[PDB]
Amino acid sequence: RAIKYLNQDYETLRNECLEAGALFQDPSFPALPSSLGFKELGPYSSKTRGIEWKRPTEICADPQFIIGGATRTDICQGALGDSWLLAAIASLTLNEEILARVVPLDQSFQENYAGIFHFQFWQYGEWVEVVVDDRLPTKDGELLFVHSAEGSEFWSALLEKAYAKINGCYEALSGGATTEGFEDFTGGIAEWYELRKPPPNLFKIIQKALEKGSLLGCSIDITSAADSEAVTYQKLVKGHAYSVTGAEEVESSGSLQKLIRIRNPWGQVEWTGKWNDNCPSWNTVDPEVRANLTERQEDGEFWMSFSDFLRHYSRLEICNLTPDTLTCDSYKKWKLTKMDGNWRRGSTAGGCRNYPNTFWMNPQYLIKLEEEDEDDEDGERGCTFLVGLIQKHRRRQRKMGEDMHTIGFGIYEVPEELTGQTNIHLSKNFFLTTRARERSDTFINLREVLNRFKLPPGEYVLVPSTFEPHKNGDFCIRVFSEKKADYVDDEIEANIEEIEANEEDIGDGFRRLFAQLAGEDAEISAFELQTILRRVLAKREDIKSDGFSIETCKIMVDMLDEDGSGKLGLKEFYILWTKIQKYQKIYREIDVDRSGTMNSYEMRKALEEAGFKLPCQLHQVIVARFADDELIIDFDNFVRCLVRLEILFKIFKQLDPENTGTIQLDLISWLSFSVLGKLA
Amino acid sequence: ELDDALDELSDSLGQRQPPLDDKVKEKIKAEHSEKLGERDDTIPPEYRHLLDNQDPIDALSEDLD
Amino acid sequence: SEEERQFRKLFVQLAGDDMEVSATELMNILNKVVTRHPDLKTDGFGIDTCRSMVAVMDSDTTGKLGFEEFKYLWNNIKKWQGIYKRFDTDRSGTIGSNELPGAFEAAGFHLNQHIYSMIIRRYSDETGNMDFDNFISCLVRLDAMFRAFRSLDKNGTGQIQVNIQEWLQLTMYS
Ligand SMILES: [Ca+2]
Ligand SMILES: [Ca+2]
Ligand SMILES: [Ca+2]
Ligand SMILES: [Ca+2]
Ligand SMILES: [Ca+2]
Ligand SMILES: [Ca+2]
Ligand SMILES: [Ca+2]
Ligand SMILES: [Ca+2]
Ligand SMILES: [Ca+2]
Ligand SMILES: [Ca+2]
């Protein structure tokens, strides 16, 4: 299991190409200038002249997917500012087990070759498989972008292409934090150190991270460094991602020396200070330790003393495979809660607390901290949790001249009287009169803002925002809570409130009303129903809808038409109206801004409130199809959405009368149930 | 008779619902992050040198002849 | 065969700044285009309908149609519009319940009396007559569910098995 990006299956597309004796041509990321870039590498940039896409089989007669292993020296930067990504790849090669998930190791130019390759990336909580054709950009017969120090090796070139593909183009990979690559290769958890304010025992931390299979990168702050010189006199590159590949303590002429191994993803240009490949102070170390640690090789990789590392670098980025801090001496039990959301101009795009008029319009999320999960590390008693707010698909916006938003979040205690009661939204006046109990360490234009917290047991509301209001974007939140000894949710449920529609339940008052609405044939048709709904909604300002469609009414009829009449009798209209009463109660209660409509956040709340426990992928699918281009759902679409969903759950349970995971259908009834619904 | 039935369906939907100045005045500061690789001089010199050497509706309507 | 290079310049002009056609823009494109064709009778493409079309074509999950998605949608409309005109044998500008089977058949949907009757119930309000917008809407959906089936039937048995998640993810589009 892993999402198939663009619904492209690798084995299906490879097998058809092999059987066709063809080589794969990806229609979704074609060998054209649009796949290169949009500005500096766009159709109108003179830097793109002479660029030709060549398969590895067109630039040599014996290409290898991997040769000599998949190692860091296979990652050499080309004509793109994606060092952040490449340092990530290089670091990944050091953990063979996790490398093998991103890069299916069994791919080959010699067996079952059909010009198609595949890779796997963690994307905002989900693993995603990406297929690419093997056409790579070249200029003057040589690979333009990433290439291996081994000229005939192509795995890393193909990996960078696949990652360019999901971002729209290669130029979009320019500029970033190495943590972004780290995460997209591990789904791991970031731990960051500022080297001017480092923890004590940071050398032990680094050694531990490496021992543990964590990925490590470092970099020099360039704004606050030689204006127009990125390359320093000691051959270090500022504003450029390096990988940390090792850390050893050595005895040197009787003295203890702490050494860190660093790699420039250029695969060339190295530190020329103490402990460089050619340093005379290597003679000062035991020969067999020398032979094991160091080589005289222009490969981007060098040693420096830890002191020099601290005096020269600004930041250490670390991606751990667990939510456990490296400074802790034991492993904890953890629970991941994934949430997703959307800020949209006109509705949920509230901006931060500096903008109190709209701040209250942001999506809100419950964080429940349990008494039982209590720990006392550092000697503070409370519930440990991590919140990571990650903004999504922001590189595709580069074409628009849009980048990462400045993001962050605040955490608030819920009032005692409001406790144990979800669906709540904290008002404007609440924010005007009460401060956040916690916040993110800052608001910043990083893809992810991840913080570690400890608070007393209870219920908290997380408010994720951009800094300025009216910014559009998708996000998701990871909440990792420390747990005591469990082994809350993982299933898809419709816990909906079923209805009394026996004859005993329906009184004279409703019977009179129905008879009056049914007319001559004693039944309510869809046309009659549309007229009824048009008419009652006309009386109410608080329920906005663009009229009520006949196709929505036809579905409502079919949902409840238990006899085969094709129209609504007494009990069937009673169920219907009772459903409509509930739908609009939910709708109006959850209608925070009193807009008469559901924004994407309100719709999520309404789905939970109607009794649906759904994964995020379903929620996004619902807002698409049921929402407009402002991501607003009016009453007409609200009812259609909830009616259809209840229909679909019930069609599924049935066809599956004994609760197994799955259902079996042929093309004829698949097209029939998916398009025409209520049939069984 | 019918107008009454609609008034009654409407009444059955129920009635909805139900100012302050900023007291705490909580303020947030923004930081800008460093973007690694964003500067062109962080690309290898070798690869720098290598790189540096009818209106629409009528056209569509026409597809439907 | 560079109908392709001409259509690429065409897409760029209507797609606007983001280089993608949104549901709103597609509503505008389609309404303007069928305005020219009096024999393609329709009460209009609504945002509701256009959003459904974008949803099912939205392979890369951008919320809008990129070139390749628009091209595929458009080429389908180009084909289906000709089917529509051919099988409007009474030249009424609409497809009646007697005209419907032969028209879904020619589109590659070879159903039966029962299925066609349920389609006519669900997609025709005009005494068993189907507008141009309902027609395109229905076929987009049928096509989407057909592609969904073919993709999920990888061994080629004529049988798919889905869990509750993929079931709801596929059927909630239609
Ligand atoms: Ca290698
Ligand atoms: Ca070296
Ligand atoms: Ca009647
Ligand atoms: Ca009935
Ligand atoms: Ca609202
Ligand atoms: Ca609507
Ligand atoms: Ca557009
Ligand atoms: Ca799209
Ligand atoms: Ca006709
Ligand atoms: Ca219509």
Count the neighbouring beta carbons within 10 Å of the beta carbon of residue B2.
12
In the block, tokens 């990789």 appear at A301
A205-233 b/e (C-beta count within 10 Å ≥ 16 → b): bbbebbeebbbbbbbbebeeeeeeebeee
What 3-state DSSP class applies to A142?
Answer: strand
Q: What contacts A371, CB < 8 A, 6 or more positions away?
A: A457
User: Measuring CA to CA, which residue among A333, A319, A451, A321 is closest to residue A388?
Assistant: A451
d(CA A448, CA A183): 10
> Which residues of chain C lie closer than 8 angstroms to A645, CB-CB?
168, 172
Q: What contacts A344, CB < 8 A, 6 or more positions away?
A: A472, A599, A600, A630, A631
C19-to-A168, A226, A391, A654, C154 alpha-carbon distances in Å = 12, 38, 22, 44, 33
Name the domain count of chain B.
1
d(CA A455, CA A380): 10
Please give the sequence-ordered ranges of beta strands (E in DSSP) within C44-173, or none if there are none: 159-163
Amino acid identity of residue A23, one-letter, is L
Q: Tell me which residue range forms the domain holding B60.
A: 1-65
**Cβ–Cβ under 8 Å, residues C172 and A625:** yes
Q: Rounded to a whole number, what is the distance in Å from the CA of B55 to chain C's nearest CA? A: 9
A282-to-A248, A275, A294, A304 alpha-carbon distances in Å = 14, 7, 8, 11
Q: Could you tell me which residues are beta bridge partners of residue A444?
A: A407, B31
Assign domain A188-332 to a CATH class.
alpha beta
d(CA B55, CA A244): 56
**Cβ–Cβ under 8 Å, residues A427 and A350:** no
Angle at C40 between CA C36 and CA C42, to 5 degrees: 100
Give the resolution to one decimal, in Å.
Answer: 2.4
Q: Could you tell me which residues are beta bridge partners of residue A565?
A: none
Ramachandran category for residue A95: left, alpha or beta (phi over 0 → left; psi -120 to 50 → alpha): beta
Determine the length of chain B.
65
User: Measuring CA to CA, which residue among C138, C137, C134, C141 is closest to residue C173?
Assistant: C141
**Cβ–Cβ under 8 Å, residues A396 and A167:** yes
Looking at chain B, which subunits does it touch, using at least 3 CB pairs closer than 8 Å as the criterion?
A, C
**Cβ–Cβ under 8 Å, residues A410 and A438:** yes
Q: Could you tell me which residues are beta bridge partners of residue A459?
A: A368
d(CA A238, CA B38): 11
What 3-state DSSP class applies to A660?
Answer: coil
- Put simply, whether B57 touches A (Cβ < 8 Å) is no
With 0-12 CB in 10 A as exposed, 13-18 as middle and 19+ as buried, what is A508?
exposed
Q: Rounded to a whole number, what is the distance in Å from the CA of B12 to chain A's nearest CA? A: 8
Q: Could you tell me which residues are beta bridge partners of residue A665?
A: C160
Residue B58 main-chain phi, psi, to 5 deg: -70, -40
DSSP annotation of A229 = -
> Which residues of chain B lie closer than 8 angstroms to C33, CB-CB?
57, 60-61, 64
C65-to-A43, A394, C60, C70, C123 alpha-carbon distances in Å = 21, 18, 9, 6, 25
d(CA C55, CA C60): 10
Q: Would strands A473-483 and A383-392 be described as parallel, antiparallel, or unpaired? A: antiparallel
Q: Which two tokens stand for residue A661?
A: 């995971």
Q: CB distance B6–A532 less than 8 Å?
A: yes
Q: Which two tokens stand for residue A99?
A: 């490398």
Fold of the CATH domain A333-492 = Jelly Rolls (2.60.120)
Protein residues with C-beta less than 5 angstroms from the ion ligand 2? A 277, 297, 299, 301-302
Delimit the domains of chain A by residue range: 1-187, 188-332, 333-492, 493-680
User: Measuring CA to CA, which residue among A494, A630, A518 is closest to residue A577?
Assistant: A518
Residue A313: its H or E element: none
Q: State the distance from the centre of ligand 4 to the C-alpha of C44, rounded, in angstroms.
A: 31
Residue A89 main-chain phi, psi, to 5 deg: -65, -50
Please give the sequence-ordered ranges of beta strands (E in DSSP) within A253-332, or none if there are none: 255-263, 301-305, 315-320
Query: Is C39 labelled a binding residue?
Result: no
C144-to-A567, A670, C26, C68, C99 alpha-carbon distances in Å = 30, 12, 18, 15, 23
Answer whether CATH 1.10.238.10 is correct for domain A493-680. yes
User: Measuring CA to CA, which residue among A65, A78, A77, A58 is closest to residue A108?
Assistant: A65
Experimental method: X-ray
Contact residues, B window 41-60, toward C, CB-based 8 Å cutoff = 55-57, 59-60
DSSP secondary structure, A406-465, as one string = -EEEEEEE--GGGSS-TT----HHHHHH---SEE-S-EESSSEEEEEEEE-SEEEEEEEE
Comparing alpha-carbon positions, the chain B residue that sits nearest to A440 is B28
Domains A188-332 and A493-680 share a fold: no
d(CA A612, CA A606): 9
Q: Looking at the CA of A65, which ligand is closest?
A: 1
Contact residues, A window 366-405, toward B, CB-based 8 Å cutoff = 404
* Spatial strand order in the sheet of A116-123: A3-4, A126-133, A116-123
d(CA A319, CA A190): 4
**How many A×B Cβ pairs under 8 Å?**
166
Determine the length of chain C.
174
Q: Would strands A438-439 and A142-143 be described as parallel, antiparallel, or unpaired? A: unpaired
Query: Is C148 labelled a binding residue?
Result: no
d(CA A431, CA A229): 46
**Cβ–Cβ under 8 Å, residues B39 and A230:** yes
Amino acid identity of residue A360, one-letter, is W
Q: State the distance from the centre of ligand 6 to the C-alpha of A633, rounded, in angstroms.
A: 7
In the block, tokens 């400045």 appear at A406
d(CA C42, CA C148): 28
d(CA A12, CA A358): 49
Domains of chain C listed by start with CATH number = 1-174 (1.10.238.10)
**Cβ–Cβ under 8 Å, residues A634 and A640:** no
How would you write C90-108 as a 3-class SS string?
A: CCCCCECCCCHHHHHHHCC
What 3-state DSSP class applies to C73?
Answer: helix
Q: Looking at the CA of C126, which ligand is closest?
A: 10
Distance of CA A534 to the CA centre of its chain: 41
Query: Is C18 labelled a binding residue?
Result: yes
Please give the sequence-ordered ranges of beta strands (E in DSSP) within chain C, or none if there are none: 159-163
d(CA A54, CA A59): 7
What 3-state DSSP class applies to C67?
Answer: helix
C17-to-A94, A400, C14, C73 alpha-carbon distances in Å = 42, 7, 9, 20
Q: At what angle do helices C23-34 and C47-57 cross, to 10 degrees?
A: 120
Contact residues, A window 236-295, toward B, CB-based 8 Å cutoff = 237-241, 266, 268-269
d(CA C29, CA C15): 10
With 0-12 CB in 10 A as exposed, 13-18 as middle and 19+ as buried, what is A20?
exposed
User: Measuring CA to CA, which residue among A75, A56, A59, A61 is closest to residue A116?
Assistant: A56
Residue A676: its H or E element: helix A667-676
**Cβ–Cβ under 8 Å, residues A453 and A384:** yes
d(CA A233, CA A272): 9
What 3-state DSSP class applies to B25?
Answer: coil
Cα atoms in the Cβ-side hemisphere of radius 13 Å centred on A641 = 29
Residue A389 main-chain phi, psi, to 5 deg: -95, 115
Residue C108 main-chain phi, psi, to 5 deg: 105, 15
Please give the sequence-ordered ranges of beta strands (E in DSSP) within A491-639, or none if there are none: 493-494, 598-599, 612-613, 632-633
* Helix residue ranges, H only, chain B: 3-11, 45-51, 56-63
Q: Would strands A126-133 and A3-4 be described as parallel, antiparallel, or unpaired? A: parallel
DSSP secondary structure, A243-259, as one string = EEEEEEEEEETTEEEEE
Ramachandran category for residue A652: left, alpha or beta (phi over 0 → left; psi -120 to 50 → alpha): alpha
> Which residues of chain B lie closer than 8 angstroms to C29, CB-CB?
57, 60
| Rg of chain C (C-alpha set) | 17
A286-to-A253, A254, A274, A303 alpha-carbon distances in Å = 9, 11, 17, 16
Residue A597: its H or E element: none
Cis peptide before B56 (omega within 30 of 0): no
Q: CB distance B50–A577 less than 8 Å?
A: no
Residue A126: its H or E element: strand A126-133
